[PDB]
Amino acid sequence: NNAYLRDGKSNLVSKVVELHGETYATTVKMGLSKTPNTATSAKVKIDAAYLETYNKAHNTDFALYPQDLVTFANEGILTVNANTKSAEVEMTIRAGEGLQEDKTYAIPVAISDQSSDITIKDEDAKHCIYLVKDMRNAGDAYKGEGVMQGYLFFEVNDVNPLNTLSFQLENGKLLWDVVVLFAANINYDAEAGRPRVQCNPNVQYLLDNNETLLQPLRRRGVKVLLGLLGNHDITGLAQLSEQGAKDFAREVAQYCKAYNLDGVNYDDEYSNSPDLSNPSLTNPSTAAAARLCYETKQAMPDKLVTVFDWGQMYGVATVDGVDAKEWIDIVVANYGSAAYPIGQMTKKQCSGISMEFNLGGGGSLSASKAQSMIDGGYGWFMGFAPSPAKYGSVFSRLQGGGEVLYGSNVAAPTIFYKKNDPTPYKYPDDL
Ligand SMILES: CC(=O)N[C@@H]1[C@@H](O)[C@H](O[C@@H]2O[C@H](CO[C@H]3O[C@H](CO[C@H]4O[C@H](CO)[C@@H](O)[C@H](O)[C@@H]4O[C@H]4O[C@H](CO)[C@@H](O)[C@H](O)[C@@H]4O)[C@@H](O)[C@H](O[C@H]4O[C@H](CO)[C@@H](O)[C@H](O)[C@@H]4O[C@H]4O[C@H](CO)[C@@H](O)[C@H](O)[C@@H]4O)[C@@H]3O)[C@@H](O)[C@H](O[C@H]3O[C@H](CO)[C@@H](O)[C@H](O)[C@@H]3O[C@H]3O[C@H](CO)[C@@H](O)[C@H](O)[C@@H]3O[C@H]3O[C@H](CO)[C@@H](O)[C@H](O)[C@@H]3O)[C@@H]2O)[C@@H](CO)O[C@H]1O
Numbered sequence: 001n002n003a004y005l006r007d008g009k010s011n012l013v014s015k016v017v018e019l020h021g022e023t024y025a026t027t028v029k030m031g032l033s034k035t036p037n038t039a040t041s042a043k044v045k046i047d048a049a050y051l052e053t054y055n056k057a058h059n060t061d062f063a064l065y066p067q068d069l070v071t072f073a074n075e076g077i078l079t080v081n082a083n084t085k086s087a088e089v090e091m092t093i094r095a096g097e098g099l100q101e102d103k104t105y106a107i108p109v110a111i112s113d114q115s116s117d118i119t120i121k122d123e124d125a126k127h128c129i130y131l132v133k134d135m136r137n138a139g140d141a142y143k144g145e146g147v148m149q150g151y152l153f154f155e156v157n158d159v160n161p162l163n164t165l166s167f168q169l170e171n172g173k174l175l176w177d178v179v180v181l182f183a184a185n186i187n188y189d190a191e192a193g194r195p196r197v198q199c200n201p202n203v204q205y206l207l208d209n210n211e212t213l214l215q216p217l218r219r220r221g222v223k224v225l226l227g228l229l230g231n232h233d234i235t236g237l238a239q240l241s242e243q244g245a246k247d248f249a250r251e252v253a254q255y256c257k258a259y260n261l262d263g264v265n266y267d268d269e270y271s272n273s274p275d276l277s278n279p280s281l282t283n284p285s286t287a288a289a290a291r292l293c294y295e296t297k298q299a300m301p302d303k304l305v306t307v308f309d310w311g312q313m314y315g316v317a318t319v320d321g322v323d324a325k326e327w328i329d330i331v332v333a334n335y336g337s338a339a340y341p342i343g344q345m346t347k348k349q350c351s352g353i354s355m356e357f358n359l360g361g362g363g364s365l366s367a368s369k370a371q372s373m374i375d376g377g378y379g380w381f382m383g384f385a386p387s388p389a390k391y392g393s394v395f396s397r398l399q400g401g402g403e404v405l406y407g408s409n410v411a412a413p414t415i416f417y418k419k420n421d422p423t424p425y426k427y428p429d430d431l
């Protein structure tokens with residue numbers, strides 16, 4: 001009887017927990033491959049030694065969440081359920097006064113004292129892990145448990161991402177949970193014969209000026225992602241070999257670490273055919289795209305790995321035996337479509353609408369559409385390329401939906417930002 005451990009609320013082996021209050025309650029669930037017998041038993045425990053193994057495997061440095069803040073019900077004993085081939089125990093995570101903001105802590109949980117009828121294949125199957133972030137002060141985008149969330153791309157060539165702050169509900173909450181700096185590029189470094197991250201001068205300016213133009217968003221609870229995009233040479237996000245994907249994933253994670261960002265969006269577009277003789281490249285395919293997503297999540301497991309569903313970026317649901325739910329946090333679709341889940345993903349990881357704010361296509365976040373997306377179980381609505389000059393049209397496309405999603409409509413904007421300028425100007429007076 002093979003067993004493994006995962007978070008019961010999410011069914012994820014590796015679960016990022018954002019604390020918005022003093023406690024967070026879930027279950028830890030042991031899955032069994034066969035119906036258990038009357039004597040089958042197991043417990044769970046915090047396994048601090050496994051954190052060293054985990055940090056080494058991922059080249060990360062997460063600190064151990066204070067154990068005194070984590071409590072299991074029932075002495076950590078798993079209640080075995082023969083009918084669902086599983087066993088669970090309640091786990092509570094308390095927010096602590098010794099915690100540092102903008103730091104990820106780890107709770108490695110292990111199966112322990114299991115009965116002799118249970119087989120645990122490896123140390124990965126023995127453990128699940130919670131990656132805990134205290135977000136109590138980064139609350140301004142948090143609109144509630146289980147609500148739909150916003151995902152917004154800025155064309156940073158033209159528009160300052162501080163304009164995220166122009167979008168609030170009437171109750172003062174910020175609309176857009178996640179924003180993308182669209183976009184850094186993948187390009188060939190001919191002199192080195194390898195792919196590299198290549199940043200245009202507009203992208204580079206934001207990174208250089210991260211403290212004033214990007215970190216104020218993160219202070220308010222907005223996740224800031226680096227967009228990655230193909231860029232008219234032999235390299236592309238769906239045509240890296242296994243080694244090329246490992247190398248590029250390491251570079252992307254270094255950008256997110258160096259600049260204190262929250263993850264990436266991958267958009268497989270505008271690349272040319274690869275040079276198949278280059279050991280960093282391979283045939284363009286969803287298998288290569290999935291490999292890159294998987295390797296990027298392994299290099300930054302606490303951060304978001306997200307894809308635009310375009311080109312060959314999305315569709316393979318397993319890499320090295322690991323399901324896509326573990327390494328695709330959000331998938332957003334092309335304007336006019338809804339994203340769909342693969343593997344054990346649900347529609348909570350999918351956009352139900354994508355709105356092209358610059359060209360007009362893709363529909364509106366109306367009361368009717370909001371209700372439709374909730375009824376369908378979608379987790380996200382996506383928008384692309386808003387600009388202060390078009391706020392009239394943009395905000396007309398956000399009426400009614402906020403009342404359905406949050407009990408509070410989107411408010412008319414009163415602030416906007418000019419490119420590369422940190423000053424919140426008055427909208428529309430300063431236009
Ligand atoms: C998610 C998601 O939505 N994903 C995608 C998303 O990508 C789409 O977004 C649009 O993408 C298209 C395509 O972008 C890519 O290609 C362009 C063009 O690349 C080619 O030309 C370059 C030379 O000019 C070459 O360097 C390059 O190799 C390509 O060459 C081929 O083709 C040319 C001929 O065109 C041949 O000569 C070549 O030989 C070869 O065949 C490219 O510019 C883009 O890359 C830039 O932007 C991305 C981010 O978007 C960055 O990551 C890149 O680093 C890069 O930026 C840097 O370089 C550029 C120069 O290329 C610098 O200007 C910049 O400062 C950086 O340094 C992509 O690779 C785009 O065309 C769309 O752009 C328009 O909209 C955006 C806003 O959304 C504007 O910011 C932008 O200015 C464009 O706006 C014009 O068009 C709009 C209508 O489409 C209109 O609303 C605007 O008002 C404006 O229109 C006015 O000007 C027009 C002339 O430009 C004029 O014709 C018109 O009448 C108006 O007067 C947009 O980004 C979206 C779309 O919904 O969906 C998905 O597909």
Ligand SMILES: [Ca+2]
Pocket residue numbers: 136137138139140219220
């Ligand atoms: Ca705060």
